Design a protein around this ligand. Structure first.
Ligand SMILES: [Zn+2]
Lengths: 328, 51, 201, 116
């Protein structure tokens, strides 16, 4: 809803003084203050203003004040994008999140999740969710909704082949770990785990460190072993991949750190037996919805509290700057 | 080369210990030189002879 | 006396130029992602650098890749990974950014410096930090590097020398004085060198 | 015009004439020449031994120890000499050179057993 953008504290839509101060700070190499960027963000009202604010933020990431990117700037930017468009600029920023630093470490997670789920989006929303959860996610009352969306778009996306696709699937299914019941989910999880372990150990020399930023230990199959133990204490895609793969000097590795290369048929037989056992023992969307029936409260009180606190901080900073400029 | 490096680390630890011991020996020498009661007694005797 | 004012003024102007034109670690130090060289200087790189500059990235940009400048994110160095299993990574808690390049590459960061399981804050000089040998370790799979749960009298030559000297003076006395290695630690062969004798290039 | 007298940097220079190898230790700073502004000028060292093999060496460590206590670094020649002298333990470089000599003698035995 648009009611989540009331404490705006507008100033002036004109870019004259703001651009002048920014150019002065960039030429004299002076550290830029977050007040100008916050004013520019609050004064957004068109594509030109959005592009100007994005360029100013990009320069701020290079200006002497690389830090001082207070959370209120990202808050106001995300809120204005959600209330205006949030299609290309917001999508590009969320895909990058390095050249601008739009870290949504607040209720912006739940805000975006609700805006993308209630409106029922598809490809763009899925890509944004993947790109924003690749790093950190799951916190504010929206983890169950995000997991539901991810499971839906994964059951609707059963393909790999490519290297980047497999890497993205693995990075997206790594952090989520609480659906102790799903079948295809854990199947794809174990499949990606095995593929990444093989790529890191029993594969080429280069693809060992740069590709996957994981641990350098030789016990990668131990993760899949622990996963299957946890799921069958009391699958399909991985078995299909194994069946498909059945029919086919500077050394950067320690001698003791041997790679379990000569290992294939025994592991495949064990995995087939374990998959048969699981099928003998033990859609998920209904269970996830039933779980969500309890949560999904949307506590905007924290939103307003943070907004008020940050607005007070910004007003105090502006007053301090005005006093320093006048008394001096 | 691993034997090289192990023995070099041992020698470096010993050299640091011996540098600390050299500092201690310089302190002892400065003490024996300045605090030497012989010089002070000779100066006092010379002052008494002058008086 | 008449001080050489021409030479003094020339040297002062040269020093002022060299000081005010102080180039950050991005202008002339811009590392190439193909030829494996550096402008301005124009010197070669070690044999090990045949692929270390093209396979991995630096530390500060690896942190910047994560949110909050990696204020509480782990990150291990590939060199120590190659030559060390004990906890010898960089657990950051106060990163200083760099304002002279994109992607937050090339900078001067400082913080907790763990060494053999000793979280030292503001330790000695920090070498092997501006190289392209680092492994990213986000929140997932946090701890991993943590794989870690001479004081001897004089040699025989000095022993015999002191014994002979004491025999010359009086008794023999075979006892020897003890020493300690409490000051400087036990730096291994793969220890980051000290920047004490390294000004700048 | 301003000296330093801080950390030392023993630098060597085998200057001489043909058929005449003779050491020449020179203690100074890292940013100073050999014959220029220095800290302490010590005597030279005897490389080869005298007649009937009797390598005599005059240990002039009296002031070297004081300078080390006050701050003085060493080089490879001084380090090896202190190691093989008596104060410091046997230099590890020379012990490993003896180990390499043992390996060379083993290789010579192998070659003598293989060839003829
Ligand atoms: Zn000569």
């Amino acid at each position: 809803d648009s009611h989540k953008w009331e404490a705006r504290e507008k100033e002036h839509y004109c870019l004259a003084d703001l651009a002048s101060l920014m150019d002065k700070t960039f030429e004299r190499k002076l550290p830029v203050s977050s007040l100008t960027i916050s004013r520019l963000i609050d004064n957004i009202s068109s594509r030109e203003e959005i592009d100007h604010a994005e360029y100013y933020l990009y320069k701020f990431r290079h200006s002497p004040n690389c830090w001082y990117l207070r959370n209120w700037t990202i808050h106001t930017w995300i809120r204005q994008c959600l209330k205006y468009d949030a299609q290309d600029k917001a999508l590009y920023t969320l895909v990058n999140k390095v050249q601008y630093g739009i870290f949504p470490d607040n209720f912006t997670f739940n805000l975006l999740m609700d805006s993308f789920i209630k409106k029922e989006n598809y490809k763009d929303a899925l890509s944004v969710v993947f790109e924003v959860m690749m790093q950190e996610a799951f916190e504010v009352p929206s983890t169950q909704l995000l997991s539901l969306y991810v499971l839906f778009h994964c059951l609707a996306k059963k393909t790999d082949f490519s290297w980047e696709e497999e890497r993205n699937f693995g990075a997206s299914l790594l952090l989520p770990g609480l659906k102790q019941k799903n079948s295809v989910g854990f199947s794809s999880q174990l499949y990606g785990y095995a593929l990444l372990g093989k790529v890191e150990l029993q594969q080429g020399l280069r693809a060992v460190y740069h590709n996957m930023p994981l641990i350098w230990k030789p016990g990668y199959l131990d993760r899949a072993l622990q996963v299957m133990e946890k799921v069958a204490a009391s699958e399909a895609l991985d078995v299909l991949g194994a069946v498909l793969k059945a029919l086919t000097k500077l050394v950067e590795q320690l001698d003791i750190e041997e790679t379990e290369q000569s290992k294939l048929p025994q592991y495949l037989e064990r995995f087939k037996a374990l998959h048969s056992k699981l099928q003998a023992l033990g859609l998920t969307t209904q269970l996830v919805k039933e779980k969500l029936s309890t949560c999904e409260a949307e506590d905007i009180a924290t939103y307003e509290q943070n907004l008020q606190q940050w607005h007070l901080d910004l007003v105090q900073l502006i007053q301090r700057e005005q006093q320093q400029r006048e008394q001096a | 080369f691993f034997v090289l490096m192990e023995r070099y680390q041992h020698y470096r630890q010993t050299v640091r210990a011996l540098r600390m011991e050299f500092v201690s020996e310089v302190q002892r020498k400065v003490h024996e030189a300045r605090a030497g009661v012989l010089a002070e007694r000779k100066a006092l005797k010379d002052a008494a002879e002058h008086r | 006396v008449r001080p050489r004012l021409i030479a003094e003024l020339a040297r002062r102007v040269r020093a002022l130029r060299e000081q005010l034109n102080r180039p950050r670690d991005s202008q002339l130090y811009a590392v190439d992602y193909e030829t494996l060289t550096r402008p301005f200087s124009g010197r070669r790189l070690p044999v090990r650098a045949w692929a270390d500059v093209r396979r991995e990235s630096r530390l500060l940009q690896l942190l910047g890749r994560l949110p909050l400048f990696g204020l509480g994110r782990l990150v291990t160095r590939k060199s120590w990974l190659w030559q060390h299993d004990e906890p010898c990574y960089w657990r950051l808690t106060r990163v200083r950014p760099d304002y002279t390049a994109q992607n937050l590459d090339h900078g001067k960061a400082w913080g907790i410096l763990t060494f053999k399981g000793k979280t030292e804050s503001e330790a000695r000089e920090i070498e092997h930090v501006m190289y392209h040998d680092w492994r990213l370790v986000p929140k997932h799979e946090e701890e991993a590097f943590t794989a870690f749960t001479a004081s001897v009298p004089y040699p025989p030559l000095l022993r015999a020398m002191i014994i002979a000297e004491r025999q010359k003076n009086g008794d023999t006395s075979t006892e020897e004085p003890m020493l300690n290695v409490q000051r400087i630690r036990m730096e291994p062969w793969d220890y980051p060198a000290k920047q004490e004798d390294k000004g700048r290039a | 015009k301003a000296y330093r007298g801080g950390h030392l940097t023993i630098r060597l220079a085998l200057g001489g004439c043909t058929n005449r190898p003779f050491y020449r230790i020179v203690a100074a700073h890292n940013k100073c020449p050999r014959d220029g502004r220095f800290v302490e000028q010590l005597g030279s060292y005897d490389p080869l031994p005298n007649s009937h093999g009797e390598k005599l060496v005059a240990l002039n460590l009296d002031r070297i120890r004081h300078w080390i206590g006050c701050g003085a670094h060493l080089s490879k020649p001084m380090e090896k000499l202190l190691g093989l002298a008596g104060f410091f333990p046997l230099h590890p470089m020379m012990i490993t050179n003896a180990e390499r000599l043992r390996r060379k003698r083993a290789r010579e035995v192998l070659l003598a057993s293989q060839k003829t």
